[PDB]
Amino acid sequence: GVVHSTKMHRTIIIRRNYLHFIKKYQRYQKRHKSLAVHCSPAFDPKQGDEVVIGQCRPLSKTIRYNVLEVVSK
Amino acid sequence: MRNYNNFNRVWKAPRRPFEKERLDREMKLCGQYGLRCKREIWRVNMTLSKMRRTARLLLTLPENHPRRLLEGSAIMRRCHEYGFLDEEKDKLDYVLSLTVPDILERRLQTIVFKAGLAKSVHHARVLIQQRHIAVAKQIVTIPSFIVRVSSERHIAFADASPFGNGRTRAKAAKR
Amino acid sequence: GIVRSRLHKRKITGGKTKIHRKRMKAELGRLPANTRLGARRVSPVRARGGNFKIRALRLDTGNFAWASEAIAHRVRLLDVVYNATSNELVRTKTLVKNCIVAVDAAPFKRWYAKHYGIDLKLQREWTRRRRNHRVEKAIADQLREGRVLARITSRPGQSGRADGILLEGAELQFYLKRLE
Amino acid sequence: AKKHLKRLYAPKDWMLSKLTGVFAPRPRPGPHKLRECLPLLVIIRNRLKYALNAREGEMILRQGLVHVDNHPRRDGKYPAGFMDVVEIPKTGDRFRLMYDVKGRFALVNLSEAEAQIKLMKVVNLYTATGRVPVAVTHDGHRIRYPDPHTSIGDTIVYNVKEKKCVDLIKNRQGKAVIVTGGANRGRIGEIVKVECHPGAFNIAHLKDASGAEFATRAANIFVIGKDLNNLQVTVPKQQGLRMNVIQEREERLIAAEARK
RNA sequence: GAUCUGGUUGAUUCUGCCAGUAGUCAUAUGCUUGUUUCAAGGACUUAGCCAUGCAUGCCUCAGAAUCACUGCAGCAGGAAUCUGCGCAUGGCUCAUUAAAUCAGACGUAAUCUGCCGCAAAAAUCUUGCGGCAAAAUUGGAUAACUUGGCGAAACGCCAAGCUAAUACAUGAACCAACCGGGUGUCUCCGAGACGCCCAGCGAAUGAAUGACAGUAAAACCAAUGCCGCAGUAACACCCAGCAGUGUUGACUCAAUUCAUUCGCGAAAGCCGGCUUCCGGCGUCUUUUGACGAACAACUGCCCUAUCAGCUGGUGAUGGCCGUGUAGUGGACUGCCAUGGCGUUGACGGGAGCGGGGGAUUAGGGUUCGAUUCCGGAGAGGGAGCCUGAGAAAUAGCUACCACUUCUACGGAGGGCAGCAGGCGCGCAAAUUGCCCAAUGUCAAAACAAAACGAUGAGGCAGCGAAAAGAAAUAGAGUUUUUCAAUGGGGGAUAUUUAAACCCAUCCAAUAUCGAGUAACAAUUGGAGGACAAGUCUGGUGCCAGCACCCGCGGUAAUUCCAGCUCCAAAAGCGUAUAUUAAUGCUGUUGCUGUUAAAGGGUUCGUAGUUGAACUGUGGGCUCCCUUGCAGCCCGUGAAAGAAAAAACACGGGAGUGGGUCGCAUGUCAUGCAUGCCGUCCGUGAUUUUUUACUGUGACUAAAGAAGCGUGACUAAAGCAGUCAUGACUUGAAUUAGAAAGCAUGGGAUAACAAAGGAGCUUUUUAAAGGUUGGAGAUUAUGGAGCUG
RNA sequence: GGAAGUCGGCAAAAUAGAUGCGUAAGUUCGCAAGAAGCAUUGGCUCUGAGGGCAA
Ligand SMILES: [K+]
Ligand SMILES: [K+]
Ligand SMILES: [K+]
Ligand SMILES: [K+]
Ligand SMILES: [K+]
Ligand SMILES: [K+]
Ligand SMILES: [K+]
Ligand SMILES: [K+]
Ligand SMILES: [K+]
Ligand SMILES: [K+]
Ligand SMILES: [K+]
Ligand SMILES: [K+]
Ligand SMILES: [Mg+2]
Ligand SMILES: [Mg+2]
Ligand SMILES: [Mg+2]
Ligand SMILES: [Mg+2]
Ligand SMILES: [Mg+2]
Ligand SMILES: [Mg+2]
Ligand SMILES: [Mg+2]
Ligand SMILES: [Mg+2]
Ligand SMILES: [Mg+2]
Ligand SMILES: [Mg+2]
Ligand SMILES: [Mg+2]
Ligand SMILES: [Mg+2]
Ligand SMILES: [Mg+2]
Ligand SMILES: [Mg+2]
Ligand SMILES: [Mg+2]
Ligand SMILES: [Mg+2]
Ligand SMILES: [Mg+2]
Ligand SMILES: [Mg+2]
Ligand SMILES: [Mg+2]
Ligand SMILES: [Mg+2]
Ligand SMILES: [Mg+2]
Ligand SMILES: [Mg+2]
Ligand SMILES: [Mg+2]
Ligand SMILES: [Mg+2]
Ligand SMILES: [Mg+2]
Ligand SMILES: [Mg+2]
Ligand SMILES: [Mg+2]
Ligand SMILES: [Mg+2]
Ligand SMILES: [Mg+2]
Ligand SMILES: [Mg+2]
Ligand SMILES: [Mg+2]
Ligand SMILES: [Mg+2]
Ligand SMILES: [Mg+2]
Ligand SMILES: [Mg+2]
Ligand SMILES: [Mg+2]
Ligand SMILES: [Mg+2]
Ligand SMILES: [Mg+2]
Ligand SMILES: [Mg+2]
Ligand SMILES: [Mg+2]
Ligand SMILES: [Mg+2]
Ligand SMILES: [Mg+2]
Ligand SMILES: [Mg+2]
Ligand SMILES: [Mg+2]
Ligand SMILES: [Mg+2]
Ligand SMILES: [Mg+2]
Ligand SMILES: [Mg+2]
Ligand SMILES: [Mg+2]
Ligand SMILES: [Mg+2]
Ligand SMILES: [Mg+2]
Ligand SMILES: [Mg+2]
Ligand SMILES: [Mg+2]
Ligand SMILES: [Mg+2]
Ligand SMILES: [Mg+2]
Ligand SMILES: [Mg+2]
Ligand SMILES: [Mg+2]
Ligand code: NA
């Protein structure tokens, strides 16, 4: 996904974009989803960067993923 | 509750109730074959449409398609085994040419009449219902029985009927 | 009673959740122990699966380890000095995991002489053990005073015991500054 | 919690008619999984026809007349499964539960002196108390001192009479395997290459005797011999070779015509 | 079967609606019903209220009988009670409910887990005798019962006296092992002996282990090994190889050592077979498969803006140390920060249990799904809880609210959305029946024998034109009378069935009833048009009435009320209300907008939708084109080398280190042992490309749909059966199922991201500085890289 | 008991400080508003926050 916000402490919001297909009209829609991810101090991502995340045990009310790799800009 | 025995439907009414041409054509068949009601004709209509619908689907597929090979031979085999088509007809395109009288010819009621066991097609109907006809030593009382070509020569009078070695009006006359 | 489910919380959208089932036994919680310093008193609890948890209400003794020496000894608790959650827990002398306590230092001094031959065939081993070995000044000063700071490592409300480890290194200097 | 099993929900391989009753016998926990088993009451009644109903099935079983892996079983809900040996000494019967080429259970008759051997697949390895290595198999056995070269996925040749390991077959390229799950169940092939995907499922590429190629997940294979020519067990009469559906239909029709 | 017809005008050509038409396991109602097979059945309204009866218990050879119980001759059967297991399943219903439940696909390394399978087990000073011995001859209570009873009763109670255990409690030395840690007195020159404390499974805290995988070769010192540095797993004797080697994608996990600290019988049990040992059961603790439970969430899911902002005192989004839980977690206390969601529709309001699936059908679609299988939830409403492996249980307990029953007035009870039944409500839905024979569940349990477990789950009949399949009401002749034939029905040596019933067989096998008006008598709607069929004959006279629409009826009615005749469907046929097609009148495929309804008064403009070209003809062989063979450094240049995965290093890598009988070593040997060029595998340093689309493959409950085979007499069905002390090595084949998720081949059309073009050498020599036996220290010589 | 007294609630009774939450119709958009209404408050022993001046 892509980094959407970095205002929390050691937590970021990422966004996933995809196209959904409607069978009746034979055409697509644009949709998106948001996730909260824990970000270790070993990384320094910025808004707009692309990250790779992995699933882990529940860490808070909304966090279920950890950042594994950052691809800058 | 919790009963899983299946059942379905075998006939459908025409969608124009009073069409002059259709009414006359159907009254021809009832008199010619001695049927009881229009429902017996409409039953034959559904079987033909099922066969023709299947054939159209297969003929769309390419010849080397596996499903066309297996289903195509299966439906042709069934048509030959029941006398709907003669063995000369081999391609799958000839099944689309089946008509209503083609199937009505194979009914047991019209088979026995043309075989010489009955004076008329109405005489054939009562004989079957009265347990006088046997197909391969088996009594059949269903006029709509469809006979197979390999079973045509086995049709004769039953062994328990007076007409062939039975009788184990005359029974009540002598008392 | 007390529950641990998320059904009563708000959604991230801020909207309210409409509940359509009753509370289940598989999501209960229980009241805290609030273990305090005093003469031993415990109460067993029957937990899921038929197992037992020991709920400690009062404790005054425990097992404490000297990490650099890789040994342990049973000593008495003297006081609770620091708690990172709240000052009210120090005031009431509440024993919870990771709080700082002061324990009796006499058994450690006694072991030091028997193992090193120092007072704050066997003689030859004592010379061997002394080689490449020194003692931190900060630890040594506490032993002469009679009390030494330690850190609780068990969970008294879950297991019913209060074990710990003596503070050394930079961790000791951190808490000494907070105390004064 | 669940104690019943509706007949419509039972596995299709048991061959139970939907019109006969509402229920089917629910197998107990045991050596084999519920979805991959054949309960004893089904074997003695619907398969061997020694019992006409459940009442007669109980008389035979509760007397201890049926042995599984050389041990009497008195429970009709016992979950028998793949590779087990069933003996009825009073009638001189010996079978092994296997899969035929269409994925159904098949009872292969066993000669004597080979009813003492069972193949087991290793599914886990761990250390017990006292540093004792232990291997746990697909049928729930625990072997407390396996061969040192054992690895997860290998096959152990086991003597049920004497309770001891006799040989080891390693999972390697060029061995003979049989498929135990999926759409290729019951087919016998030759390991061409195992593709490894960490985290995901590994994929095994196989090739039967005729040269046909197929694949499946690595957890569904079961080593049974060194090579396709020399197996370590007797397989059903198809030898695990799947034939074309059109060809099968023709031959069955031809044989039927010749049968009369 | 990819179809249309009547109604606007004096006529015509349109737009457009109204009416007609066919289906519905879609309901109700009306008129009619001879035979047979197969079936739904108080969901809709009132998750309204309930009289009565029944729906969950279990004993074998194998836990405990002194019934003051029964037979016969102590044996056998055994009422009642204690103990062990189960009652958290099955059955019913659909009220609540919108990232909640559910579907496909995943996770628990975040956890608990009785019954079942395969396994494990060396702790713990007891008993008898008076120091000696060893098959451990352990202890105290309680029911049923007896006595006295209380109370109107109550699935209500009190006291005393007796006695079992697989209930409860206690408790086993020697036989009997291996290994380690800490320590006192003697013999030797640091070694040895002896003495002492502790050393079991599980649990808690602390300290270690849970591998390595890259630059070479020397000296000096102390301590050791072997002969001075050649062999060389490790180890001061018993053991000269008794672990130098757990698993995974990954672990603070499995397991082991050291220190300190706290549930575990050999049931002190029960039966047999052999003549003392042999078998079958039963049970405590530890461990991990299986059957489960609980939590989490990748994509998807109706209408509404006359609902635009929502959340955050008092948890809203995150952080730190804790608490609680079986476990993760704002689940919760304290402190800190200011976040989190929203026109890609948040928040609010409305109607709904979710799927598998049903109806309709050219295709695309529209619509239904309370209801048999799977998942969820509830037991009048609302909370709370004990027991238990598992319940926030309701034919369990506690309280309140609303209803309600008995009473001697003191008190005591109740929960049919289980099966039958009532009352109400409504347009709307059966018998207070028989049985455990089949299918299953429980359990101390095979069946039999003195000797039959329960089961309204379930099955079988009754009622039952919801719906579905087959099929009578005659046939053949002769001039208006002659022949046969058969069922409906009545019966039966009988068959079926748990017993009955229905179906099937028969009306002599010596021996067995019956059609002529075959009264054994077919109905429901119509006859101007749409739409098949009368310009008939009476009555009425804009009345009565018909008419879905157009329209008839005012004295000659093709339409009303009747009689004749005729038409359509037929054991069925009308009517009402919904819904699908008809409908290209919701239009993606596929509508219309000058005048029929409908382009905004004109511009600017943000989300959004859409968006120009280009990096590319391979060539030669037997002028372009067709075909086919075989080779190209497959533009140009330049001959192993440049030219367009590479380079390292691991023996704990490869079923000894993958392919290309006796001679030695060892003998204190169970050494019984040993030898006669590119690929594997794991690690480190360097490599710079997705998505979408398309082709294969993998993974995907049945029932339902499609479909192969099969003369249940045919068919709706079903999965069976066919052929000769048994064979068929019998059969029960295949297919499709949205979207999302997994692996991999292809690169034409496209999408995402980046950039905005002046932030833009290679190699070869030379010089300068800055493994030594092993383990523990010291130093130096060089690699390799650093500059000049 | 609570306006039945009286021409008439005259007179008397009643509300009451401060702090937190909360607050309708109407409107000249300023108000209405202290609208209405609910809750806390003592004593003692502690804890936290809010500063200046020199190295
Ligand atoms: K007109
Ligand atoms: K008995
Ligand atoms: K009991
Ligand atoms: K033991
Ligand atoms: K009494
Ligand atoms: K935490
Ligand atoms: K009822
Ligand atoms: K039964
Ligand atoms: K019935
Ligand atoms: K019928
Ligand atoms: K008759
Ligand atoms: K007239
Ligand atoms: Mg995994
Ligand atoms: Mg007009
Ligand atoms: Mg005119
Ligand atoms: Mg009707
Ligand atoms: Mg009959
Ligand atoms: Mg009858
Ligand atoms: Mg119902
Ligand atoms: Mg109701
Ligand atoms: Mg229950
Ligand atoms: Mg249930
Ligand atoms: Mg699922
Ligand atoms: Mg002992
Ligand atoms: Mg006990
Ligand atoms: Mg390891
Ligand atoms: Mg060793
Ligand atoms: Mg463990
Ligand atoms: Mg959840
Ligand atoms: Mg707060
Ligand atoms: Mg509802
Ligand atoms: Mg439903
Ligand atoms: Mg409803
Ligand atoms: Mg259900
Ligand atoms: Mg419940
Ligand atoms: Mg009720
Ligand atoms: Mg229990
Ligand atoms: Mg309850
Ligand atoms: Mg009840
Ligand atoms: Mg009284
Ligand atoms: Mg109640
Ligand atoms: Mg009805
Ligand atoms: Mg019995
Ligand atoms: Mg019943
Ligand atoms: Mg029932
Ligand atoms: Mg009649
Ligand atoms: Mg009759
Ligand atoms: Mg019947
Ligand atoms: Mg008339
Ligand atoms: Mg006409
Ligand atoms: Mg009508
Ligand atoms: Mg007249
Ligand atoms: Mg008319
Ligand atoms: Mg429509
Ligand atoms: Mg159309
Ligand atoms: Mg239009
Ligand atoms: Mg206009
Ligand atoms: Mg204009
Ligand atoms: Mg373009
Ligand atoms: Mg060239
Ligand atoms: Mg290598
Ligand atoms: Mg008052
Ligand atoms: Mg007055
Ligand atoms: Mg006044
Ligand atoms: Mg206002
Ligand atoms: Mg105020
Ligand atoms: Mg006012
Ligand atoms: Na908090």
From TrEMBL, chain B:
GO-annotated biological processes: ribosomal small subunit biogenesis; translation
A Pfam short name: S4
rRNA-binding recorded as keyword: yes
Domain RNA-binding S4: 106-173
SMART domains, per the entry: Ribosomal_S4, S4
UniProt KW rRNA-binding keyword: yes
Transmembrane portions of the chain: none
One GO MF term attached to the UniProt entry: rRNA binding
Keywords for the protein's UniProt record, in alphabetical order: Ribonucleoprotein, Ribosomal protein, RNA-binding, rRNA-binding
Domain Small ribosomal subunit protein uS4 N-terminal: from-to ranges: 5-105
GO cellular component: cytosolic small ribosomal subunit
Homology family: Belongs to the universal ribosomal protein uS4 family.
Name of protein: Small ribosomal subunit protein uS4
Species of provenance: Leishmania major
TrEMBL record, chain D:
Residue ranges of domain KOW in the record: 174-195
Molecular function GO terms recorded: RNA binding; rRNA binding; structural constituent of ribosome
InterPro entries: KOW, Rib_uL2_dom2, Ribosomal_eS4, Ribosomal_eS4_C, Ribosomal_eS4_central_region, Ribosomal_eS4_central_sf, Ribosomal_eS4_KOW, Ribosomal_eS4_N
GO CC terms, sorted: cytoplasm; cytosolic small ribosomal subunit; nucleolus
Keywords for the protein's UniProt record, in alphabetical order: Ribonucleoprotein, Ribosomal protein, RNA-binding, rRNA-binding
Domain called RNA-binding S4: residue spans: 40-86
Xref: Pfam families: 40S_S4_C (PF16121), KOW (PF00467), Ribosomal_S4e (PF00900), RS4NT (PF08071), S4 (PF01479)
All residue ranges annotated as the Small ribosomal subunit protein eS4 C-terminal domain in the record: 208-255
Domain Small ribosomal subunit protein eS4 N-terminal as annotated: residue spans: 2-35
Domain Small ribosomal subunit protein eS4 central region, residue spans: 91-164
Keyword Glycoprotein on entry: no
Gene3D superfamilies recorded: 2.30.30.30, 2.40.50.740, RNA-binding S4 domain
GO biological process, alphabetically ordered: translation
Entry's family note: Belongs to the eukaryotic ribosomal protein eS4 family.
PANTHER family: 30S/40S RIBOSOMAL PROTEIN S4, SMALL RIBOSOMAL SUBUNIT PROTEIN ES4
HAMAP family assigned to the protein according to its UniProt record, in alphabetical order: Ribosomal_eS4
Protein name: 40S ribosomal protein S4
Species: Leishmania major
Gene: RS4
